[PDB]
Amino acid sequence: AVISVKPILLAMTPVFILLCLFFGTRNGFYDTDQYHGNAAAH
Amino acid sequence: PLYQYAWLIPVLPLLGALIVGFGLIAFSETTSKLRRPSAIFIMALMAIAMGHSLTLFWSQVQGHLPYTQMIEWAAAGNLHIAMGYVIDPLAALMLVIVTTVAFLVMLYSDGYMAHDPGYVRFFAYLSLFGSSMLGLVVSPNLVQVYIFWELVGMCSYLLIGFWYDRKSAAEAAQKAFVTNRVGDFGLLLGMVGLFWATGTFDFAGMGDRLTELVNTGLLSPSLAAILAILVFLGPVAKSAQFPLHVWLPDAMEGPTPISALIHAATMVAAGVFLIARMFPVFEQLPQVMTTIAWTGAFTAFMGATIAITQNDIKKSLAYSTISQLGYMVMGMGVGAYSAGLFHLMTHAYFKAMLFLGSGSVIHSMEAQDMRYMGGLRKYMPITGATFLVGCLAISGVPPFAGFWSKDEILGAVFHANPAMWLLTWLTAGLTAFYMFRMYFMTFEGKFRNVESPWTMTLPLVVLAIPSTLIGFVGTPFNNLFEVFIHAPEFLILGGSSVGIGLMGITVAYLMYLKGTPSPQAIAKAIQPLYQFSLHKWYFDELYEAVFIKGCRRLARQVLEVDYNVVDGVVNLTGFVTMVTGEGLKYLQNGRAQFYALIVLLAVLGFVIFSV
């Protein structure tokens, strides 16, 4: 027998999209607690 | 039935750690303050594994043939890769050893770890260790004896570097990883060779194919021997044998429960475990058995000589277990397949007892030095008594198991190559000496410089029961260990060991208890071999001098070649096509007459090579 990636992907990627949009909101250090910088490395 | 969900054994602890891992990353504060229920959860997982392994061991001693259930892991056109499990009796034995020691030590470390950050990460690491080693044991083939054989190495890296606040633990973990990656280099070359030559990796076909090919030509005699010692170069790193021994004692900067698993017959045993499951590559090669045997012998003499002059208890037990691993590797070398594992099954118990007692006393020391802990046992009855039992185990006094182990191996060494006897014999004397000065300096006398839990002490008794009762499954009148573990009158020999052990314990009694000789002036005098063997046989300084300097200088030797001889050559292209532009513009000079020249004289050359 053999296992296929197709239903695995179909089950994972909606969760990925939703959690991506969710954890986009959850944030921290970069907002105000520190980090006067601007994401440039100079 | 069982034997179908045997793959379930590594998965329950792992799963536990996995969950708890997702609990240490996400929801950190809860799982950091949720200390004991996670502990007993992981303990329940390991207990299910222990019961499962015990039922397998009982069904296998009762009677059955092995049941392997493999699966194709990595595929290609013609060849294949298999990765599953087999359950032979040796695997069940090592499995039950791992599970019992891990359960008892997890209970122990419920008490060793006081109010302390890292009480759950510890058990996560330790359950990952359980999964890794339990999966190493259940292995039909060799590729799966590299996967878990390195997962256990990284888990040792983690456990050693638990107290990342410190500096010595970091260096120790780096060292104990790099040395095992040298071992990986060896075993990886060996695996790739044994696949290049034979065409399979199953520990049984690998011997049939080798003897078949060597009956014909196509590789011999040292073209089947170079890729058989490389396989042995893994255990040399993982079982701490000569010359890759420096990593083990420096791994004692980590905690004591850790140092009790990965110095019992749980991790370092993996080396000899490999040597057990590869005798159908070594039996048809007497050119390397000798190498293995003398390696183990020199390791034994090393670890016996270094531990005497040490004063740190844990760092002394390190060289002790190195020596006992040397005895086992010796037994592996000269023939004996069912006598090295007896010492293994005995050494996974009393050495763990000694480490756990060391953890108890060093925990009740408010350190770590035998010179600054005098007569205990006025407040440490249980720990002292059980330490004493484990101390009797690793020496003569025949009712204890270690005599029944270090009599079979010595008999095998005497019947075959007795020259290697009379060095191992005095080495057993040295064992009897250092292990009893470790007691007379530590649990008897007057408490020199300047009190025992319950959870921390039950495991010591539960392991004292084996360490007194394991010897009686050997005993060559009704030997059951040799019949259940097979490879694919004696008083003149045995009593000599007890007599030499009596010499050792007597010289230790009259020298550290009262000290009618001069322990200081025997070394504060002409004798310089206290400095030597207290600088631990300068190997450490040797490697730190010639090897660590080598790569560290070669890296610059290459990098400046990179930044100058390679980079400058191409930046020179930009320089050239820049200075060309800087110097060609002078052709343009701001003169109409110069154009009048190089307009019509710019041509009239185009007529000369034309007609």
Partner: protein
């Protein structure tokens, strides 16, 4: 499908210049939604992807006067990498939240080089291949030169110069194979089915090699990499190190093993000794380098040698080891350079001896970084080891292949040297004094942990049951290597 996949990010990127704002917040959500929708298009066009050849190809005609055709094509050899870019560029965008300096240009160029990275795999025309190979220059140039680094001047200039002057023989070679005979092919398949004489097979081969060995940096064709990957922020770097090197490796496979096999059989030992040189060279230069990022860049240079060896073998296993290594390093190095960027953001420092014991307060990045570091080296249970093992097995199964294995296995010892020394130098030990008064970053906001967890799930799922990634191209790689052995 592929045309929608390539043009929707670019077309939707042209909306950003007229998109409301008060400070710069609603741009990144738009970019992320575009990336996620396009990844959904990938995985939904992957349902109708049966698993030997182009399982879907949509041709058209722009210029019949040359031979230029918009010949998109998926394949077993090109679909994993399409998935990889669609996932990892999305996560770069999900890593580039704090970008406040010119975010419009950021999330325009990032989406432009999101179609400029799926196109190079979903293209079968040798002129459009050149087009898509070339259009990574200006976006990467601006991504390096504006935000990221102090030496970014020299880095970006050197990048664009070398990846133009060595994006140079690709067109020449496509032409040189296009008009050998009496057919103006300009197509992968139609041009692989032609009989090329040895006298210029091994010349067009070197033409391909000068291009495919600077982006897949080999012996000296690497000096752009430390400067372009050192002076670069994290989300830029995830793309630059996880896709473009894979672009070089992919194009090397498809243009030098299906299309010049007779010269491949004669030059492959060169690739092999070059690969082991690459490993040892990069590992030593990484253990010597002290900053923080150049180290991991040389680690990437080290890890590419397995690809060189696996392609320069000739069995059905080394090729899969190469592709598995590619999909592995794309997932590993991304998390590594992300964590390096984060550590710099919290410390405002890269140099190692200038910081220590930071893992007492910043004790969330330490675990994630330790895990990705264990994943860098050939640790079992992960895809970094399956690739190495398959490379060793497949190559040895085929320069009297016993010395080169001995030299390539030195990496097994030599990778943890600098990785664990880096960990020791940074996170272990006692906390620094007030010399580090940057307030140790509030340990990885959940948003970083999600990035690395979603990069660290697929890698373990591969390392345990690798066939998941190998089910994709067992057929295509089988046909390729059957061809390349049929010649010999």
């Amino acid at each position: 499908w592929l045309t929608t996949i390539i043009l929707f990010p670019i077309v939707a990127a042209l909306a950003i210049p007229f998109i409301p704002t008060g400070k710069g917040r609603p741009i990144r959500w738009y970019a992320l939604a575009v990336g996620l929708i396009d990844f959904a298009l990938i995985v939904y066009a992957f349902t109708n992807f049966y698993d030997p050849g182009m399982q879907l190809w949509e041709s058209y005609d722009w210029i019949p006067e040359i031979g230029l055709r918009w010949s998109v094509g998926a394949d077993g050899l090109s679909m994993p990498l399409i998935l990889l870019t669609g996932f990892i560029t999305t996560l770069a965008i999900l890593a580039a939240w704090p970008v406040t300096l010119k975010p419009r240009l950021f999330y325009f160029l990032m989406l432009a080089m999101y179609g400029g990275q799926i196109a190079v795999f979903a293209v079968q025309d040798m002129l459009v291949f050149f087009l898509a190979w070339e259009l990574e220059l200006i976006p990467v140039y601006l991504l390096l030169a504006i935000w990221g680094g102090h030496k970014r001047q020299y880095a970006a200039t050197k990048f664009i110069l070398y990846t133009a002057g060595s994006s140079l023989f690709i067109l020449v070679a496509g032409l040189a194979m296009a008009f050998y005979g009496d057919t103006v092919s300009f197509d992968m398949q139609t041009l692989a089915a032609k009989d090329y004489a040895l006298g210029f097979q091994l010349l067009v081969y070197a033409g391909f090699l000068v291009a495919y060995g600077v982006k897949l940096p080999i012996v000296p064709l690497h000096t752009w990499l430390p400067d372009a990957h050192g002076e670069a922020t994290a989300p830029v770097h995830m793309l630059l190190a996880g896709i473009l090197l894979k672009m070089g490796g992919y194009a090397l496979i498809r243009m030098n093993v299906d299309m010049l096999p007779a010269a491949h059989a004669k030059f492959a030992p060169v690739l092999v000794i070059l690969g082991v040189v690459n490993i040892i060279y990069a590992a030593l230069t990484s253990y010597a380098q002290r900053n923080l990022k150049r180290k991991i860049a040389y680690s990437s240079i080290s890890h590419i040698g397995f690809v060189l060896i696996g392609i320069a073998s000739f069995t059905n296993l080394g090729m899969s080891g190469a592709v598995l290594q590619m999909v592995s390093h794309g997932l590993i190095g991304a998390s590594l350079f992300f964590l390096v960027g984060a550590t710099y953001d919290r410390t405002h420092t890269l140099i190692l001896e200038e910081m220590g014991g930071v893992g007492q307060k910043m004790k969330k990045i330490f675990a994630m970084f330790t895990a990705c570091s264990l994943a860098s080296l050939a640790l079992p249970g992960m895809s970094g080891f399956v690739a190495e093992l398959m490379v060793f097995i497949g190559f040895a199964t085929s320069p009297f292949r016993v010395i080169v294995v001995f030299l390539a296995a030195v990496g097994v010892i030599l990778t943890p040297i600098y990785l664990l020394s880096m960990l020791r130098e940074i996170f272990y030990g006692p906390e620094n004094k007030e010399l580090v008064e940057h307030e140790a970053l509030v340990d990885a906001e959940p948003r970083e942990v999600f990035i690395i967890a979603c990069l660290l799930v697929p890698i373990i799922g591969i390392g345990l049951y690798p066939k998941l990634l190998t089910q994709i191209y067992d057929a295509t790689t089988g046909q390729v290597i059957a061809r390349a052995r049929e010649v010999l």
